[PDB]
């Protein structure tokens, strides 16, 4: 379906760029044609409005562009600059060629087609200081395509190697990469940001790639002396303790980060975190725990009664999880029965493996319970203990990725204590008694300790 | 104010120089048109469509489509001062332009929603404006075009009264006999927009012959590429409640 030349150009045929309200027909004869047709209606006695219907009223023309029903919103649409294209070739289409298409994109900006070949135009469209370009599906690329020009660069849904084939042919002028949905690797990549390649870098939007250091990134800012815009929020190397406030401290460049507002005190309490960062356990250093059972199938209440020599009972319950080694696995809650159970387990964990600790969290990691009851005549007896049981969950992490401090998501792995069940619960403890007269669920936290103040960031010496 | 007593002049000359610097000035900006509204230019203006002077009504006709082309509320309060059906009348003049002059201030009214549509159609101007187009050669088709599109486009009931008043034949005319782009794009776009509805749509169209005539127009190399665009929605408007095999059956090979 496309090279890069053959995609624009395509395009620049999808949009058009010789015909109706835009471009040519009769419609022009007088107001879109050169001057003969035009002029020849005054020289020869006023044919009028009368117009001999070679043309159009243009407002009419252009009344059919600003028409709520008449499609060109775009064409109905995206690109806003497109649509200016569109009204320029209305106003008049005649001089207008690829000597023109090749001075507009200053930028270029005109999303999806699901293709991947980049070739020669990009150097012929003159202008191009900015890309920002998705659901296309580059791989790695014919760099040479760089103009001396190229300042920001969105990539969302590509799927490249790595940055080098680009890299390794620099205009002096890249503001920004940005590759959301994509795929990039670890902390070394930083390299390819660094003052050989890219001096500029203003700006960045970098998610859904896996990028694993924060001072590897620094090597990087301490080569590119422009940052003020930026996704770090977003990459394994946000996980580093100290994340916010020393990326703020880092270097002579990010004035701002992540989202928050000033106006009370927080500026005052958080200059200097970097200098301390020199210092702290400067990788990442995870608290996790493991939440209270729920759901807890009062398999007792099949025996009510509960008290004879089986039915008569304890109880395990405990989660069983994938937390990133591939995963790495531990029977971690595992307490009896009350009618509600708290159960507790916590880890914690010294991470390196920063892409896969990622994966880890956005992917869909995978939890389970189990409950075992015993059933038992002393003898007890038990069949494991016994078990009745659900364990899976899909589970999911984002926030430390975020580079904040904390995650918690509670996990149904879904029901043995039903309502009636649970009801039951508390009727196999009123039948003991009038004798004698989530589904199933577990919570989770994973913390990855971050920080209130420059001191308390500080802390992450000990992580 | 000063532009509006001018025409209040016997003159006719001074009335048709009024007329035609009012639409000058409200074809750019909605606000200049409620300014000249306001001054009860929409009252006197109506009141000259009678008159039986070809560039008088030529250029009243103009500024009530420029009038009436920018917001809902300018073309609602231009049919209330009583508009059909003297305009309807002009249609059937000698003069061509005075009739690209009604169909244009026409597709300007009903364009925004369908209850001017609907006012129209209860008005009888849909057979009116056919005709006229059949009875037309040229660009003085293409507002007339553009409106019945517009009405089919805006519901279910005004396709119908279109549909029953002939219209789809009057379009397959169109994108046969003429021979410029934009007027076949109109008239493949007004066919997509009629044949987008309940099947019964695509099938008062597909008897007139009309997809065969798409389909080839959309497989030539000669044509405009926002012509092969329309041509293109058409066909997958029509051919996606179109029940009828006979008409679908020679899509298949081709």
Same mark, same amino acid.
């Given at each position: 379906?496309?090279?890069?030349?053959?995609?624009?150009?395509?395009?620049?045929?999808?949009?058009?760029?010789?015909?109706?309200?835009?471009?040519?027909?009769?419609?022009?004869?007088?107001?879109?044609?050169? =001057?003969?047709?035009?002029?020849?209606?005054?020289?020869?006695?006023?044919?009028?409005?009368?117009?001999?219907?070679?043309?159009?009223?243009?407002?009419?023309?252009?009344?059919?562009?600003?028409?709520?029903?008449?499609?060109?919103?775009?064409?109905?649409?995206?690109?806003?600059?497109?649509?200016?294209?569109?009204?320029?070739?209305?106003?008049?289409? $005649?001089?207008?060629?690829?000597?023109?298409?090749?001075?507009?994109?200053?930028?270029?900006?005109?999303?999806?087609?699901?293709?991947?070949?980049?070739?020669?135009?990009?150097?012929?469209?003159?202008?191009?200081?900015?890309?920002?370009?998705?659901?296309?599906?580059?791989?790695?690329?014919?760099?040479?395509?760089?103009?001396?020009?190229?300042?920001?660069?969105?990539?969302?849904?590509?799927?490249?190697?790595?940055?080098?084939?680009?890299?390794?042919?620099?205009?002096?002028?890249?503001?920004?990469?940005?590759?959301?949905?994509?795929?990039?690797?670890?902390?070394?990549?930083?390299?390819?940001?660094?003052?050989?390649?890219?001096?500029? $870098?203003?700006?960045?939007?970098?998610?859904?790639?896996?990028?694993?250091?924060? =001072?590897?990134?620094?090597?990087?800012?301490?080569?590119?002396?422009?940052?003020?815009?930026?996704?770090? =929020?977003?990459?394994?190397?946000?996980?580093?303790?100290?994340?916010?406030?020393?990326?703020?401290?880092?270097?002579?460049?990010?004035?701002?980060?992540?989202?928050?507002?000033?106006?009370?005190?927080?500026?005052?309490?958080?200059?200097?975190?970097?200098?301390?960062?020199?210092?702290?356990?400067?990788?990442?250093?995870?608290?996790?725990?493991?939440?209270?059972?729920?759901?807890?199938?009062?398999?007792?209440?099949?025996?009510?009664?509960?008290?004879?020599?089986?039915?008569?009972?304890?109880?395990?319950?405990?989660?069983?999880?994938?937390?990133?080694?591939?995963?790495?696995?531990?029977?971690?809650?595992?307490?009896?029965?009350?009618?509600?159970?708290?159960?507790?387990?916590?880890?914690?964990?010294?991470?390196?493996?920063?892409?896969?600790?990622?994966?880890?969290?956005?992917?869909?990691?995978?939890?389970?319970?189990?409950?075992?009851?015993?059933?038992?005549?002393?003898?007890?007896? =038990?069949?494991?203990?016994?078990?009745?049981?659900?364990?899976?969950?899909?589970?999911?992490?984002?926030?430390?990725?975020?580079?904040?401090?904390?995650?918690?998501?509670?996990?149904?792995?879904?029901?043995?204590?039903?309502?009636?069940?649970?009801?039951?619960?508390?009727?196999?403890?009123?039948?003991?008694?009038?004798?004698?007269?989530?589904?199933?669920?577990?919570?989770?936290?994973?913390?990855?300790?971050?920080?209130?103040?420059?001191?308390?960031?500080?802390?992450?010496?000990?992580? | 104010?000063?532009?509006?007593?001018?025409?209040?002049?016997?003159?006719?000359?001074?009335?048709?120089?009024?007329?035609?610097?009012?639409?000058?000035?409200?074809?750019?900006?909605?606000?200049?048109?409620?300014? *000249?509204?306001?001054?009860?230019?929409? !009252?006197?203006?109506?009141?000259?469509?009678?008159?039986?002077?070809?560039?008088?009504?030529?250029?009243?006709?103009?500024?009530?489509?420029?009038?009436?082309?920018?917001?809902?509320?300018?073309?609602?309060?231009?049919?209330?001062?009583?508009?059909?059906?003297?305009?309807?009348?002009?249609? +059937?003049?000698?003069?061509?332009?005075? +009739?690209?002059?009604?169909?244009?201030?026409?597709?300007?009214?009903? +364009?925004?929603?369908?209850?001017?549509?609907?006012?129209? *159609?209860?008005?009888?101007?849909?057979?009116?404006?056919?005709?006229?187009?059949?009875?037309?050669?040229?660009?003085?088709?293409?507002?007339?075009?553009?409106?019945?599109?517009?009405?089919?486009?805006?519901?279910?009931?005004? !396709?119908?009264?279109?549909?029953?008043? +002939?219209?789809?034949?009057?379009?397959?005319?169109?994108?046969?006999?003429?021979?410029?782009?934009?007027?076949?794009?109109? !008239? !493949?776009?007004?066919?997509?927009?009629?044949?987008?509805?309940?099947?019964?749509?695509?099938?008062? *169209?597909?008897?007139?012959?009309?997809?065969? *005539?798409?389909?080839?127009?959309?497989?030539?190399?000669?044509?405009?590429?926002?012509?092969?665009?329309?041509?293109?929605?058409?066909?997958?408007?029509?051919?996606?409640?179109?029940?009828?095999?006979?008409?679908?059956?020679?899509?298949?090979?081709?």
């Amino acid at each position: 379906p496309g090279t890069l030349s053959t995609a624009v150009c395509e395009h620049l045929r999808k949009l058009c760029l010789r015909e109706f309200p835009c471009g040519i027909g009769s419609w022009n004869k007088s107001r879109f044609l050169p =001057q003969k047709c035009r002029v020849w209606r005054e020289l020869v006695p006023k044919e009028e409005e009368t117009l001999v219907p070679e043309e159009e009223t243009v407002e009419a023309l252009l009344g059919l562009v600003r028409s709520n029903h008449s499609p060109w919103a775009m064409l109905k649409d995206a690109s806003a600059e497109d649509r200016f294209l569109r009204e320029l070739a209305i106003q008049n289409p $005649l001089m207008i060629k690829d000597t023109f298409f090749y001075s507009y994109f200053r930028s270029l900006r005109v999303v999806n087609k699901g293709v991947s070949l980049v070739d020669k135009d990009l150097l012929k469209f003159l202008k191009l200081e900015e890309l920002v370009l998705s659901a296309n599906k580059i791989e790695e690329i014919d760099a040479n395509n760089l103009p001396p020009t190229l300042k920001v660069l969105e990539l969302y849904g590509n799927l490249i190697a790595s940055m080098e084939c680009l890299c390794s042919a620099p205009p002096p002028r890249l503001q920004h990469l940005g590759l959301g949905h994509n795929k990039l690797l670890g902390p070394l990549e930083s390299l390819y940001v660094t003052s050989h390649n890219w001096p500029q $870098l203003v700006s960045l939007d970098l998610g859904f790639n896996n990028l694993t250091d924060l =001072q590897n990134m620094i090597l990087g800012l301490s080569t590119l002396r422009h940052l003020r815009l930026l996704v770090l =929020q977003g990459n394994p190397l946000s996980l580093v303790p100290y994340y916010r406030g020393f990326t703020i401290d880092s270097l002579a460049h990010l004035c701002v980060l992540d989202d928050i507002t000033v106006s009370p005190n927080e500026k005052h309490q958080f200059r200097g975190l970097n200098i301390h960062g020199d210092l702290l356990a400067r990788e990442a250093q995870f608290v996790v725990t493991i939440g209270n059972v729920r759901g807890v199938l009062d398999s007792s209440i099949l025996d009510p009664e509960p008290g004879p020599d089986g039915p008569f009972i304890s109880y395990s319950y405990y989660v069983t999880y994938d937390f990133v080694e591939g995963t790495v696995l531990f029977n971690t809650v595992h307490k009896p029965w009350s009618d509600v159970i708290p159960c507790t387990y916590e880890m914690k964990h010294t991470l390196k493996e920063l892409i896969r600790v990622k994966a880890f969290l956005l992917a869909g990691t995978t939890v389970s319970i189990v409950e075992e009851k015993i059933l038992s005549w002393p003898v007890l007896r =038990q069949d494991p203990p016994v078990l009745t049981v659900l364990g899976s969950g899909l589970v999911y992490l984002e926030p430390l990725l975020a580079g904040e401090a904390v995650v918690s998501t509670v996990c149904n792995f879904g029901v043995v204590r039903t309502l009636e069940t649970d009801r039951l619960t508390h009727a196999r403890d009123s039948k003991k008694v009038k004798k004698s007269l989530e589904p199933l669920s577990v919570e989770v936290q994973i913390q990855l300790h971050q920080y209130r103040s420059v001191e308390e960031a500080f802390l992450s010496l000990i992580d | 104010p000063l532009l509006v007593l001018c025409i209040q002049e016997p003159e006719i000359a001074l009335k048709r120089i009024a007329a035609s610097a009012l639409s000058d000035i409200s074809k750019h900006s909605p606000e200049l048109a409620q300014t *000249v509204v306001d001054a009860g230019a929409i !009252a006197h203006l109506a009141q000259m469509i009678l008159n039986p002077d070809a560039k008088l009504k030529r250029q009243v006709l103009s500024a009530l489509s420029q009038i009436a082309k920018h917001s809902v509320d300018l073309a609602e309060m231009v049919v209330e001062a009583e508009i059909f059906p003297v305009v309807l009348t002009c249609l +059937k003049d000698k003069d061509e332009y005075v +009739k690209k002059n009604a169909c244009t201030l026409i597709r300007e009214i009903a +364009k925004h929603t369908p209850e001017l549509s609907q006012l129209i *159609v209860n008005a009888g101007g849909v057979a009116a404006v056919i005709d006229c187009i059949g009875s037309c050669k040229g660009n003085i088709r293409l507002p007339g075009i553009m409106m019945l599109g517009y009405v089919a486009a805006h519901s279910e009931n005004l !396709a119908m009264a279109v549909i029953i008043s +002939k219209g789809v034949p009057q379009l397959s005319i169109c994108l046969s006999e003429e021979p410029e782009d934009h007027i076949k794009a109109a !008239a !493949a776009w007004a066919l997509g927009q009629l044949g987008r509805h309940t099947p019964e749509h695509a099938r008062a *169209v597909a008897v007139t012959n009309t997809l065969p *005539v798409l389909l080839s127009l959309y497989m030539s190399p000669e044509s405009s590429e926002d012509l092969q665009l329309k041509s293109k929605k058409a066909i997958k408007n029509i051919l996606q409640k179109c029940t009828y095999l006979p008409a679908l059956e020679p899509f298949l090979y081709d």
